[PDB]
Design a protein around this motif. Sequence first.
Motif, PDB file in Angstrom:
ATOM      1  N   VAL A  38      29.444  40.647  92.638  1.00  8.21           N
ATOM      2  CA  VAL A  38      30.285  39.757  92.000  1.00  8.21           C
ATOM      3  C   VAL A  38      31.449  39.604  93.360  1.00  8.21           C
ATOM      4  N   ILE A  39      31.617  38.361  93.763  1.00 11.17           N
ATOM      5  CA  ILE A  39      32.247  38.064  94.925  1.00 11.17           C
ATOM      6  C   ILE A  39      33.493  37.571  94.595  1.00 11.17           C
ATOM      7  N   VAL A  40      34.724  38.099  95.300  1.00 11.66           N
ATOM      8  CA  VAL A  40      36.291  37.702  94.942  1.00 11.66           C
ATOM      9  C   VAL A  40      36.939  37.416  96.238  1.00 11.66           C
ATOM     10  N   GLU A  85      43.026  42.154  95.419  1.00  9.79           N
ATOM     11  CA  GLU A  85      43.860  42.454  94.204  1.00  9.79           C
ATOM     12  C   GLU A  85      42.927  42.215  93.178  1.00  9.79           C
ATOM     13  N   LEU A  86      42.074  41.139  93.155  1.00  7.67           N
ATOM     14  CA  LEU A  86      41.067  40.762  92.025  1.00  7.67           C
ATOM     15  C   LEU A  86      40.018  41.558  91.871  1.00  7.67           C
ATOM     16  N   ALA A  87      39.556  42.267  93.007  1.00 10.32           N
ATOM     17  CA  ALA A  87      38.321  43.249  93.028  1.00 10.32           C
ATOM     18  C   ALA A  87      38.582  44.544  91.988  1.00 10.32           C
ATOM     19  N   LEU A  88      39.782  44.897  92.229  1.00  8.33           N
ATOM     20  CA  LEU A  88      40.393  45.983  91.394  1.00  8.33           C
ATOM     21  C   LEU A  88      40.351  45.501  89.892  1.00  8.33           C
ATOM     22  N   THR A 133      36.353  46.512  99.373  1.00  7.32           N
ATOM     23  CA  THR A 133      37.006  45.292 100.158  1.00  7.32           C
ATOM     24  C   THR A 133      37.439  45.925 101.221  1.00  7.32           C
ATOM     25  N   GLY A 134      38.216  45.046 101.995  1.00 10.14           N
ATOM     26  CA  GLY A 134      38.362  45.285 103.363  1.00 10.14           C
ATOM     27  C   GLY A 134      39.724  46.190 103.232  1.00 10.14           C
ATOM     28  N   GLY A 135      40.133  46.623 102.058  1.00 10.39           N
ATOM     29  CA  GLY A 135      41.349  47.604 102.061  1.00 10.39           C
ATOM     30  C   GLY A 135      40.981  48.995 101.785  1.00 10.39           C
TER      31      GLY A 135
END
Length: 375
Positions: A75-77, A81-84, A106-108
């Motif tokens: 599932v790509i976003v 913020e949306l991944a979480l 993510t990259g975070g």
Amino acid sequence: GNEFEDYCLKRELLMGIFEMGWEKPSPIQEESIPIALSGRDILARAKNGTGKSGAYLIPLLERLDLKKDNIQAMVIVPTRELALQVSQICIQVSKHMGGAKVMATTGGTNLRDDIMRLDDTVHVVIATPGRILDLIKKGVAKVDHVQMIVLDEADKLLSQDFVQIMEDIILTLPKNRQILLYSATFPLSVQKFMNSHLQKPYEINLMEELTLKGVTQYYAYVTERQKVHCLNTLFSRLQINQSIIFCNSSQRVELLAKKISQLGYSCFYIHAKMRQEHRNRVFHDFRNGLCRNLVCTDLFTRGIDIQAVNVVINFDFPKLAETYLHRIGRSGRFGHLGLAINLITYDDRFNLKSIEEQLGTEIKPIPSNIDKSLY
């Protein structure tokens, strides 16, 4: 009414759902769930307010075979913020599913810990493009077993920044991977991705929107002086019910209309330099089949919603892609195997290809023998 249970889902999943508070399926869920479980790809227009989270997770979790330790779904976003937002839900929905491992990278999130984590069993991945591609190309993320991928807010995923990433990621996947696309808007990039990758996608909330669905497209290398001859041949070879011809100017429209009415053919014509009540009358008459062929400029603002039009010709080729789309496309309500032809001069080549790529479709040269079944 309609209830979840009717879709035939896993007990653990229905409970997981019910525990969220989802008593009855939302229209988008009602639309996308039973279609996804059938294997069909989805192209859906929906606001960024998710909302659509539950719409594609339920069918996704249901397809899973937990006897297998490979990744089966992604599932790509666009944003972290949306991944979480999505991951947390996916977890909270699958809590009663035994051993359903959800990974949100993510990259975070710290890269190293995620490189590590992936040595263990993971079924569902929820990532931003930059990270997931990074994980895939290294070899850590084994993706040769994916059977479903989801693009949420694809309008952002298919922007110039993320487009190539997104493109590369699909190349790593199986040729038959089920793709579910969800976006707020529907620009041309989405049309690229649609026509490039998706396969017979069920459309949700896309009426009154244009696609090349059903349309066969051709192109001829011909000069201005040679055009009329080619056209004359086309009138002589093609099996036409009703046709439509486009030109780049009312001048040329008239000039051509007189030119083809001279060769023994019958046609009407309209253009911007007319009066409204007139064009409406001619069009009305052409709609009732009082002639085979119509000549016109870009007037309608709509899709050409005439059933009997089985051929569209671009006597003059356009510069912009949206224009081409408006001439060629249909509004999803009308899907008939219509034909499309482009008489192209030298000045037009760089627009033939630039448009071919911009819509993410294939425009093949003309065969002497055109399959009648194609139209």
